[PDB]
Amino acid sequence: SMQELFNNLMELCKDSQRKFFYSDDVSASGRTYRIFSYNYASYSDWLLPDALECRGIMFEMDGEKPVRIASRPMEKFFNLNENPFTMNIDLNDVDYILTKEDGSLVSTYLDGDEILFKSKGSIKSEQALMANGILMNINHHRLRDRLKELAEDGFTANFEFVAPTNRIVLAYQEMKIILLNVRENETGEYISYDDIYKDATLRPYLVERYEIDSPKWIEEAKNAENIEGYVAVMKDGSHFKIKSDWYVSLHSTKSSLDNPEKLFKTIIDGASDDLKAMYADDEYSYRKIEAFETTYLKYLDRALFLVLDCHNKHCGKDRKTYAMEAQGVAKGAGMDHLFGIIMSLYQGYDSQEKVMCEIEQNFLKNYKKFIPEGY
Ligand SMILES: Nc1ncnc2c1ncn2[C@@H]1O[C@H](COP(=O)(O)CP(=O)(O)OP(=O)(O)O)[C@@H](O)[C@H]1O
Numbered sequence: 029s030m031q032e033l034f035n036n037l038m039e040l041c042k043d044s045q046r047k048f049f050y051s052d053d054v055s056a057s058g059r060t061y062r063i064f065s066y067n068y069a070s071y072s073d074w075l076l077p078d079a080l081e082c083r084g085i086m087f088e089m090d091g092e093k094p095v096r097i098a099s100r101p102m103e104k105f106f107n108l109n110e111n112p113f114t115m116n117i118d119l120n121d122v123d124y125i126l127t128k129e130d131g132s133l134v135s136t137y138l139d140g141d142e143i144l145f146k147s148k149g150s151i152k153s154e155q156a157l158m159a160n161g162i163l164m165n166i167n168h169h170r171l172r173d174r175l176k177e178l179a180e181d182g183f184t185a186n187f188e189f190v191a192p193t194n195r196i197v198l199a200y201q202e203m204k205i206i207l208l209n210v211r212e213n214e215t216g217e218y219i220s221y222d223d224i225y226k227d228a229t230l231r232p233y234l235v236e237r238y239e240i241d242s243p244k245w246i247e248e249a250k251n252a253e254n255i256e257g258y259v260a261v262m263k264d265g266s267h268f269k270i271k272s273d274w275y276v277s278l279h280s281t282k283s284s285l286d287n288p289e290k291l292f293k294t295i296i297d298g299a300s301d302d303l304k305a306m307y308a309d310d311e312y313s314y315r316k317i318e319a320f321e322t323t324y325l326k327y328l329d330r331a332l333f334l335v336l337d338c339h340n341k342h343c344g345k346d347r348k349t350y351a352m353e354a355q356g357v358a359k360g361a362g363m364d365h366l367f368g369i370i371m372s373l374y375q376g377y378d379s380q381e382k383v384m385c386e387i388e389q390n391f392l393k394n395y396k397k398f399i400p401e402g403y
């Protein structure tokens with residue numbers, strides 16, 4: 029049930045903000061929403077109860093009790109051969125593929141009498157607000173009506189928001205929203221592509237589908253240029269993706285496999301999953317990347333706890349006493365480089381998020397000492 033899904037999601041957020049977390053938002057109409065997201069997660073984490081649904085699902089809240097699922101974005105999915113979820117896949121079970129658009133996901137939710145958009149982790153991000161602005165345009169009033177009724181019926185429409193001012197890798201000329209899929213809030217089931225295709229009002233915004241009879245599209249995707257790739261939809265409705273080496277080589281940034289600082293940066297940027305899949309045929313590289321991932325997740329858990337714990341437990345005391353406790357915790361953990369971050373938490377950080385960004389940047393300066401043994 030909806031309450032059971034909510035309980036499992038709250039259970040995932042107990043660990044640390046490094047993994048699964050939630051955040052409360054208030055819309056212009058004053059309604060209270062709780063979004064469940066994530067930062068870094070290993071295969072083992074994705075195996076936890078309903079963890080795959082912890083990437084953007086939103087509930088309208090009444091205190092700590094959920095009233096309804098306001099928005100249901102897609103479940104987390106991965107690149108082919110990225111981890112056990114997408115290994116040993118029967119490629120002949122691929123139903124069809126879709127153009128993988130390169131922007132930012134925006135998902136609908138009904139707010140009072142208004143149909144609005146939310147980005148991955150916020151209802152007021154820059155993409156979310158710009159997306160809302162588009163839906164207000166008279167040239168999209170028929171779509172707006174369509175989306176509003178869907179939402180009042182318990183369905184979430186997921187779009188890729190693209191724009192020249194929202195460039196990731198691909199260069200889009202105009203700002204627009206491309207319809208990717210429509211998911212039922214309560215069950216998580218998707219309306220078939222065909223059913224969406226049937227609606228002449230929606231078709232113009234619908235992402236392009238390519239029918240499939242063989243897996244030849246895969247190697248062609250990997251070797252293509254000027255495209256990110258495609259999202260495959262299986263006979264059972266599940267997804268997996270194929271990104272071109274060209275796209276990943278630009279998204280990764282530089283020479284990750286030849287420079288530990290750059291590899292760690294890729295991991296921090298959340299792009300090592302693509303890199304890992306790209307080198308799936310290169311066992312050494314694939315596993316090397318995993319080792320750095322594991323090393324980074326382990327460090328982040330430890331560092332985050334250490335800094336937050338020390339601040340919480342000694343924030344009240346004076347500066348000298350605090351500094352001594354900070355020195356103690358830092359020194360007593362081979363984490364001497366964290367003293368500065370701890371000293372900065374005394375006057376607090378704009379969020380357990382700000383703290384995490386300083387830790388990430390600070391890690392890139394002291395990366396040398398954490399390179400996994402053997403590399
Ligand atoms: N046709 C399509 N179907 C589904 N998703 C699509 C799509 N084309 C574009 N996408 C985008 O693909 C995104 C997920 O794949 P990625 O781009 O690799 C981000 P991720 O790494 O999986 O999650 P993360 O960035 O929070 O770590 C979706 O959020 C969606 O916005």
Ligand SMILES: [Ca+2]
Binds near residue numbers: 130131196
């Ligand atoms: Ca993307």
Ligand SMILES: [Cl-]
Binds near residue numbers: 055151
């Ligand atoms: Cl709003």
Ligand SMILES: [Cl-]
Binds near residue numbers: 131132148
């Ligand atoms: Cl996204």
Ligand SMILES: [Mg+2]
Binds near residue numbers: 298300
């Ligand atoms: Mg990623």
